[model samples]
Target: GGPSVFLFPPKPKDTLMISRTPEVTCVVVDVSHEDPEVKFNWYVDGVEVHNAKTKPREEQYNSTYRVVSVLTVLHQDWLNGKEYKCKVSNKALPAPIEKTISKAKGQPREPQVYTLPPSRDELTKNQVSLTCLVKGFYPSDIAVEWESNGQPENNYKTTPPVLDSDGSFFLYSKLTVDKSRWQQGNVFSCSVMHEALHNHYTQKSLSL
Candidate 1:
């Protein structure tokens, strides 16, 4: 086994991912036989990157919230359109094994997907507002986008995340569409794109 990465949604090759709300695709490798002395470095868009190694087993929020280990590579929330690379090998072994993630279409990796605002159709606009909430994800490699109908456009606005002292995060944004627009019930979508996963999620909310 060598260096391998996984995109949460397991998107298809040639998928043009949305820049917002990108999902986390973890880079996995065979560290079973190798010594714990292996060195791992990460890169995005061909540049160096960093992440706190996740230690969910020992303690969920041990290291700065949902982290257990630390490494220069193999972290999440790297910028979009940037190439991600992982260089791994046991420096103690003398012969290092390495791999690279490129700008072009390479092997597709799957990433996890969490739908925001769980109930889309039940929302009423006249109600002052409704929010599509997304959370409990890694790397924070995601953005919230909205579109109605089949038109090609980015129409939604997203707010930044707010961190709480209890070790959690939240954000909220609202867009009020014309009430008549939903009489016909057009398609409102939230697509999350990052790494190899381009996830398409659609919801219908009513305007009062």
Candidate 2:
């Protein structure tokens, strides 16, 4: 059969988070009939890029071959509305196949915040845990803070953000508190700060 091309971090948009030094990676895969002559090309805003790295073709079960190419961009041009394209070529194809990704079509998504109280098993112990779930946010830069009855709490651990299939990010933060404080019905709150929110933050409160 003919060759097929696919791009990772796929489709109409890709998320780019601001950082001191940032790099975006694009992966291209080409599946074709037993040939190592597949060629891969990368372009940014109509201009060709030369820094792409390609791997040797691997044989698949069906006697087809799989070739992978990776391209890394270091500048912030993507955030400034630039387009990145990957082109794949092979002798089995009539023409070159192309796939594109860009941040121009991306929109900031606000995070959904929720607070989970300690479970019954945890309540039996000297310490209890409160969890905050932050879901479906874009760009990955976020801040989570915990408070107990309006007092700032420091005994909390936040997980690194995890990427979702749709280009969003989610994470959870857990706060540790004494069982006595939880038994006394103290109000614990979690505040999520992100750029997508109009007020820049969202809060969720939990109580005994």
Candidate 3:
């Protein structure tokens, strides 16, 4: 039998709007033999909470039985400066595992997106690589995608997330197209999703 693990939500850190309000998810995984005994305990603000709704799931991977437990909570508690945690108990471990939720501790920032045009030589050769750069964000998690003529485009390259001196993050995605098509006003754009943006998202477009 293997040990138990917990999948805690990423903290919002200093992102004002995000840190103050958000639904939280906590997951626990126990790997053991078939029909293993498992128990779940939940807490908020250091106090035990009863009737906490938890979802349980099971899966088999590499001949090992995996049991998963999930807990969900809304924003008010967090917004009111409360703490959330989960406890996992199983025979596979010597003690119950306790996981806590925390906010991101650094400065919060917004993301900016822009496009990088192909080089002069590449443009002259009828090839264009339009790269979109998304920068000035924290917590280092984001989803980026490209579009052409209002349609999703997948033929693109994405750089790994890069850290900046201001405790922010940066990344870029590149899409290739014919230079003539780009010059002919082919609408290319990049879209980004992040917690800092709230209900809206960031999308930037460019063309010759």
The candidate maximizing lDDT is: 2
Give candidate 1 regions above 4 Å deviation.
Answer: 1-130, 152-155, 164-168, 194-208
Q: Report the alpha-carbon TM-score of model 2 versus the true structure.
A: 0.53
TM-score of each: 0.34, 0.53, 0.72
The window of 10 residues in a row where model 3 has the poorest summed lDDT is 10-19
lDDT by residue for model 2 over 1-208, one digit each (tens)? Answer: 3767666542112222333333334333345445447787888899999987887656666565667776666544754567778787777777887888765355779899988898887778989889999999987767788986688999999998999997899999999998998888988899887767765667899986
The candidate that achieves the highest TM-score relative to the unseen native structure: 3
Over the full model, what C-alpha lDDT does candidate 3 score relative to the true structure?
0.68
lDDT-wise, the better of 2 and 3 is: 2
Lowest summed lDDT across 10 adjacent residues in model 1 is found at: 59-68
Candidate 3 stretches greater than 4 Å from native: 8-30, 47-57, 73-84, 124-127, 178-180
- Candidate 3 or 1, higher TM-score: 3
Q: Please, what's the RMSD in Å of model 1?
A: 14.0
* Superior by TM-score: candidate 2 or candidate 3: 3
- TM-score of structure candidate 1: 0.34
| Candidate 1 per-residue C-alpha lDDT over 1-208 given as tens digits, one digit per residue, 9 for 90 to 100 | 3333332331221234334232334444333333433445555566666652533322223231111123322223232334545455553344554444433333323333333342444455532233555443333334455555645334456766555343344445454455455454545554444343434332333222
